[PDB]
Design an enzyme around this catalytic site. Structure first.
Site, PDB file in Angstrom:
ATOM      1  N   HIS A  86      67.052 -21.316 -46.906  1.00 15.93           N
ATOM      2  CA  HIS A  86      66.669 -20.352 -47.932  1.00 15.93           C
ATOM      3  C   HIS A  86      66.032 -21.056 -49.126  1.00 15.93           C
ATOM      4  O   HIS A  86      66.098 -22.278 -49.247  1.00 15.93           O
ATOM      5  CB  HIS A  86      67.888 -19.551 -48.388  1.00 15.93           C
ATOM      6  CG  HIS A  86      69.051 -20.404 -48.789  1.00 15.93           C
ATOM      7  ND1 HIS A  86      69.904 -20.990 -47.878  1.00 15.93           N
ATOM      8  CD2 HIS A  86      69.499 -20.770 -50.013  1.00 15.93           C
ATOM      9  CE1 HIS A  86      70.828 -21.679 -48.524  1.00 15.93           C
ATOM     10  NE2 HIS A  86      70.604 -21.562 -49.820  1.00 15.93           N
ATOM     11  N   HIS A  88      66.271 -22.171 -52.534  1.00 15.83           N
ATOM     12  CA  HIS A  88      67.230 -22.435 -53.600  1.00 15.83           C
ATOM     13  C   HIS A  88      67.165 -23.893 -54.040  1.00 15.83           C
ATOM     14  O   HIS A  88      66.667 -24.750 -53.308  1.00 15.83           O
ATOM     15  CB  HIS A  88      68.646 -22.091 -53.139  1.00 15.83           C
ATOM     16  CG  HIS A  88      69.108 -20.738 -53.585  1.00 15.83           C
ATOM     17  ND1 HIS A  88      70.267 -20.149 -53.123  1.00 15.83           N
ATOM     18  CD2 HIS A  88      68.564 -19.858 -54.459  1.00 15.83           C
ATOM     19  CE1 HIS A  88      70.412 -18.964 -53.691  1.00 15.83           C
ATOM     20  NE2 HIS A  88      69.392 -18.764 -54.506  1.00 15.83           N
ATOM     21  N   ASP A  90      69.352 -25.957 -54.081  1.00 11.24           N
ATOM     22  CA  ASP A  90      70.123 -26.767 -53.144  1.00 11.24           C
ATOM     23  C   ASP A  90      69.454 -26.796 -51.774  1.00 11.24           C
ATOM     24  O   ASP A  90      70.043 -27.252 -50.794  1.00 11.24           O
ATOM     25  CB  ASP A  90      71.547 -26.223 -53.018  1.00 11.24           C
ATOM     26  CG  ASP A  90      71.656 -25.116 -51.988  1.00 11.24           C
ATOM     27  OD1 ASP A  90      70.905 -24.124 -52.101  1.00 11.24           O
ATOM     28  OD2 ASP A  90      72.491 -25.242 -51.068  1.00 11.24           O
ATOM     29  N   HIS A 149      73.462 -14.721 -48.065  1.00  3.53           N
ATOM     30  CA  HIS A 149      73.457 -15.483 -49.310  1.00  3.53           C
ATOM     31  C   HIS A 149      72.115 -15.352 -50.021  1.00  3.53           C
ATOM     32  O   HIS A 149      72.037 -15.447 -51.246  1.00  3.53           O
ATOM     33  CB  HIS A 149      73.758 -16.955 -49.030  1.00  3.53           C
ATOM     34  CG  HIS A 149      73.453 -17.859 -50.186  1.00  3.53           C
ATOM     35  ND1 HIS A 149      74.075 -17.748 -51.412  1.00  3.53           N
ATOM     36  CD2 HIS A 149      72.587 -18.894 -50.296  1.00  3.53           C
ATOM     37  CE1 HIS A 149      73.603 -18.675 -52.228  1.00  3.53           C
ATOM     38  NE2 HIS A 149      72.700 -19.383 -51.575  1.00  3.53           N
ATOM     39  N   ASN A 180      79.433 -15.180 -56.748  1.00  2.00           N
ATOM     40  CA  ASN A 180      78.295 -14.468 -57.317  1.00  2.00           C
ATOM     41  C   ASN A 180      77.386 -13.928 -56.216  1.00  2.00           C
ATOM     42  O   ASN A 180      76.950 -14.671 -55.337  1.00  2.00           O
ATOM     43  CB  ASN A 180      77.499 -15.391 -58.243  1.00  2.00           C
ATOM     44  CG  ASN A 180      76.959 -14.662 -59.458  1.00  2.00           C
ATOM     45  OD1 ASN A 180      77.527 -13.663 -59.901  1.00  2.00           O
ATOM     46  ND2 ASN A 180      75.856 -15.161 -60.005  1.00  2.00           N
TER      47      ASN A 180
HETATM   48  O1  RTD Z   1      76.363 -20.197 -54.409  1.00  3.97           O
HETATM   49  C1  RTD Z   1      75.581 -20.661 -53.546  1.00  3.97           C
HETATM   50  O2  RTD Z   1      75.766 -20.594 -52.313  1.00  3.97           O
HETATM   51  C2  RTD Z   1      74.270 -21.386 -54.093  1.00  3.97           C
HETATM   52  S1  RTD Z   1      73.662 -22.708 -52.960  1.00  3.97           S
HETATM   53  C3  RTD Z   1      74.459 -21.813 -55.514  1.00  3.97           C
HETATM   54  C4  RTD Z   1      73.569 -21.452 -56.527  1.00  3.97           C
HETATM   55  C5  RTD Z   1      73.810 -21.827 -57.845  1.00  3.97           C
HETATM   56  C6  RTD Z   1      74.937 -22.569 -58.174  1.00  3.97           C
HETATM   57  C7  RTD Z   1      75.827 -22.939 -57.168  1.00  3.97           C
HETATM   58  C8  RTD Z   1      75.595 -22.563 -55.851  1.00  3.97           C
HETATM   59 ZN    ZN Z   2      71.860 -21.472 -51.893  1.00  3.51          ZN
HETATM   60 ZN    ZN Z   3      74.458 -23.862 -51.003  1.00  4.40          ZN
END
Ligand code: RTD
Ligand code: ZN
Ligand code: ZN
Length: 227
Positions: A86, A88, A90, A149, A180
């Site tokens: 996805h 993001h 990360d 997600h 979230n």
């Molecule tokens: O919560 C998640 O899965 C994504 S990768 C995320 C985004 C912002 C901060 C922490 C995690």
């Molecule tokens: Zn993510």
């Molecule tokens: Zn993640």
């Protein structure tokens, strides 16, 4: 140096590290500041005979810089592939570095539709629901169960080891909830997992997005987080 029985790599800071999961399957996890706190991002590394591969980059280009420098030290090879599930930080956080060492950030046309929306450099953006990838001596295949997600989230499959890497979609067992869901689909999530656990009923190991590796149970637990 040569001939050694050591595993699990780590950086001078420790923020990033890996771990031997299978013959050519490893799990790398880095850390990136967020909301005045630390947030680990699970991952995976492939040890093919034509260049290592990453199932997901780091939080930022400066973060992934130390991530690739690790894999390209014990695997006597270089990374030339980056699968993105996805859009993001990360996932494509190091999209800049991937286009500096000749790396390719594979991803679906949708995964890029959101990338540029954030400011990223947009990944390859040339995939679909499923894509049988093959790097040197490895077998991989993507899959799009549904919206969970992220609007453009997908799970990774390996037709050879039965190892699935759902990611943020497939929460770990230790987890308690999803968290979230501002940019997530909790109503579609339940449908996505039901498609992942169904697509394969012989998984050997499941790697979540934030936690630790487990098994097919992760998929079942994920549903409990929604209901
Ligand atoms: O919560 C998640 O899965 C994504 S990768 C995320 C985004 C912002 C901060 C922490 C995690
Ligand atoms: Zn993510
Ligand atoms: Zn993640």
């Amino acid at each position: 140096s040569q001939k050694v029985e050591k595993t699990v790599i780590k950086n001078e800071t420790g923020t990033i590290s890996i771990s031997q999961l299978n013959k050519n399957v490893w799990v790398h996890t880095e850390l990136g500041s967020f909301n005045g706190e630390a947030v680990p991002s699970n991952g995976l590394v492939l040890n093919t005979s034509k260049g290592l591969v990453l199932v997901d980059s780091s939080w930022d280009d400066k973060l992934t810089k130390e991530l690739i420098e690790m894999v390209e030290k014990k695997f006597q090879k270089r990374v030339t592939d980056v699968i993105i599930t996805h859009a993001h930080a990360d996932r494509i956080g190091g999209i800049k570095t991937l286009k500096e060492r000749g790396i390719k950030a594979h991803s679906t046309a949708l995964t890029a539709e959101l990338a540029k929306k954030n400011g990223y450099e947009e990944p390859l953006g040339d995939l679909q629901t499923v894509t049988n990838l093959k790097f040197g001596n490895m077998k991989v295949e993507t899959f799009y169960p549904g919206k969970g997600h992220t609007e453009d989230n997908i799970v990774v499959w390996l037709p050879q080891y039965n190892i699935l890497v759902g990611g943020c979609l497939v929460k770990s067992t230790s987890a308690k909830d999803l968290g979230n869901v501002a940019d997530a689909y909790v109503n579609e999530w339940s449908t996505s997992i039901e498609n992942v656990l169904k697509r394969y009923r012989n998984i050997n190991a499941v790697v979540p997005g934030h936690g630790e590796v487990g098994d097919k149970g992760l998929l079942l637990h994920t549903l409990d987080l929604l209901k």
